[PDB]
Design a protein around this ligand. Structure first.
Ligand SMILES: C=C(C)CCOP(=O)(O)OP(=O)(O)O
Ligand SMILES: C=C(C)CCOP(=O)(O)OP(=O)(O)O
Ligand SMILES: CCCNCC(P(=O)(O)O)P(=O)(O)O
Ligand SMILES: CCCNCC(P(=O)(O)O)P(=O)(O)O
Ligand SMILES: [Mg+2]
Ligand SMILES: [Mg+2]
Ligand SMILES: [Mg+2]
Ligand SMILES: [Mg+2]
Ligand SMILES: [Mg+2]
Ligand SMILES: [Mg+2]
Lengths: 362, 362
């Protein structure tokens, strides 16, 4: 509501500072400033801002149940917005490199940045790297003399690294561990032995949950100086859980949601990704169903994709997702309940985060 | 050399720390731990270690004239090495992405990281990103209670951003600035109107000088708690001057130093880089020489590349270089003299940095 407007207003402020500074300190010319402005806008906007708005929400929750002088209310909320944009830009960074890494065509209804007619792949790689650097400029500039600066940055470091590590689990999830070797070329897996719930869970824990859930939540606490007033173990546990469900949704939608609605084009089947559908399929498939899977998965051929998708339809995975959903709903409620004990209001924020995640169709 | 091996010993400490942390905190498996170990070795080792050793030298220079407890001596020298390695991992990061962006084949006598038989481009982009995250994991781990932690991290960020911006100038140095529009396909320059000394200076200042000279020198002062005893404006001026000269050498070597000596294969001509040779050549070429250049520059064909090299030879470009060097000598020497005023030992450290840079053959 008033929350979204404030968040969006801050972007313009952040962008102005960044681009103005490129002029006065970095000798940028008008056309390259425009290039980076459009880059920023394309890769940072048009998402649903779940991450960014979570830190705002968490911050709002503590303001509402307490009393603050108007000045201190604005500092915190502005800080929450800047923090949120740090996260949004960090995802921008990830999505840029990820689309290149996954050979994707579309993101958020437009071409992937690296596929923009005037954008070279080589430049896109560096653009992505600029996006992450931007998070650091904005933290030092806006949070210069904040008590939480050191904790915020340290946490940002840890989360970004966990995500880089997860991306390598993800991007190497179709290879055989025992044949993984920089010196020797290696084909994708034939046995699919490493398509297990445990291995799947580990990829997702790192590539997704830390920066999508833990960071927005804990960052919200940081700007409020309210970390102490929650059971951090619970925050961690609820972030990993909602985070995992989030990625399961993403994996399902990759296959089943029309691009016209999703805003992106699926590549999981073609890239031989250890997705939730593939693992769950191998969890229930008979001998003939497995054999057909192995002969068709991980190949660009549009016909072979249809054989996998057909197999996915026949195995009632759509319904296995419901049984997973139901299970997750129980666990989330359980953790929300446990969060109410020390912080009834943060638990409400987590409830909101959950409902948004639960109800999304992207 | 003894100090070299002492420096390398800290690399083993850092590696062992990173890798052990991946096992105990990141659920890494032995095989991926191996992969990342070899990635680290290939990307971080085999260079001259100029950047890393420079921070060791700076610190050694202050220790010789200052009063410290022996424990404090050991700490400063260990910090020096760790900081040196932060910088070497930062270059590792830049070199991995840069070799992808420039389409290069060889780095430090071996294939570029992305050209390793079992590496692939998509995980190489991420490996590169991992390298930079390591610099931050290092900083936070080894420097946690250090008074210079905030200054070091803040300088590191700015330097990193500077470089990223510089890579953006570099990678778009062959487009007409007016044609720079992400919406519209990007044809290479035909007039070469932007191959001017001032435009060349801008690229180099940002892509090279900050991370190659400024960062290690100031790093040496931070870990030493010796920043107050230098004129920082002098440090900046000398860093940018020696840094530019360093890059000039690199551009010359790209074309003239045989790959067996250089440890890398030149791509500047192929990529249509705004290199020193191109800028200098275009600044003295006659009408026919310009024409033939325009007809052959920026193409992969080895016969084309040969003509540009043939043209460069006839243009007597080693004579422009000797004239550039002779003046750089004057100016560097003048800055070293000025540094002696507040800091004779730092001045001497800059003379050593310069000496090594001046007669490097790769
Ligand atoms: C972490 C994942 C699964 C990438 C997609 O994130 P979103 O679908 O939340 O992307 P936007 O809201 O930013 O578009
Ligand atoms: C080539 C440039 C200008 C980047 C630095 O490379 P170096 O020449 O310092 O490479 P290593 O010593 O790290 O191999
Ligand atoms: C950590 C990077 C997040 N990646 C999410 C993507 P993926 O499913 O993990 O490749 P996408 O489905 O949005 O392209
Ligand atoms: C950060 C940019 C430094 N890269 C140096 C390279 P370039 O000449 O700038 O591409 P190389 O010649 O070592 O490949
Ligand atoms: Mg993807
Ligand atoms: Mg991906
Ligand atoms: Mg996906
Ligand atoms: Mg290069
Ligand atoms: Mg380059
Ligand atoms: Mg070069």
């Amino acid at each position: 509501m008033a929350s979204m407007e404030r968040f969006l207003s801050v972007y313009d402020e952040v962008q102005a500072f960044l681009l103005d500074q490129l002029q006065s300190k970095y000798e940028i010319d008008p056309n390259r400033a425009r290039y980076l402005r459009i880059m920023m806008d394309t890769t940072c906007l048009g998402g649903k801002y779940f991450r960014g708005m979570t830190v705002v929400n968490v911050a709002e929750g503590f303001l509402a149940v307490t009393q603050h002088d108007e000045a201190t209310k604005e500092r915190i909320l502005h800080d929450a917005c800047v923090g949120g944009w740090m996260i949004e830009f960090l995802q921008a960074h990830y999505l840029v490199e990820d689309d290149i890494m996954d050979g994707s065509v579309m993101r958020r209804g437009k071409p992937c940045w690296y596929r923009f007619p005037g954008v070279t792949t080589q430049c896109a790689i560096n653009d992505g790297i600029i996006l992450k650097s931007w998070t650091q400029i904005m933290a030092w500039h806006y949070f210069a003399d904040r008590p939480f600066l050191k904790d915020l940055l340290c946490l940002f470091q840890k989360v970004d690294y966990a995500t880089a590590v997860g991306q390598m689990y993800d991007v190497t999830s179709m290879c055989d561990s025992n044949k993984l070797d920089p010196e020797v070329a290696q084909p994708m897996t034939t046995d699919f032995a490493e398509f297990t719930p445990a291995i799947y869970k580990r990829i997702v824990k790192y590539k997704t949950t830390f920066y999508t859930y833990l960071l927005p939540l804990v960052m919200g606490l940081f700007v409020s100086e309210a970390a102490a007033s929650v059971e951090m173990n619970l925050v961690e546990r609820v972030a990993h859980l909602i985070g995992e469900y989030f990625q399961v949704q993403d994996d399902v939608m990759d296959c089943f949601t029309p691009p016209e609605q999703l805003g992106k084009v699926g590549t999981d089947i073609e890239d031989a990704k250890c997705s939730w559908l593939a693992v769950t399929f191998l969890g229930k498939a008979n001998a003939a169903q497995v054999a057909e899977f192995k002969a068709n998965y991980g190949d660009k051929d549009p016909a072979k994709v249809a054989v996998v998708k057909r197999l996915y339809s026949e195995a009632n995975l759509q319904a296995d997702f419901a049984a997973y959903e139901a299970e997750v709903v129980r666990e989330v409620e359980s953790l929300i309940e446990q969060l109410k004990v020390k912080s009834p209001t943060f638990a409400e924020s987590v409830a909101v985060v959950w409902e948004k995640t639960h109800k999304r169709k992207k």
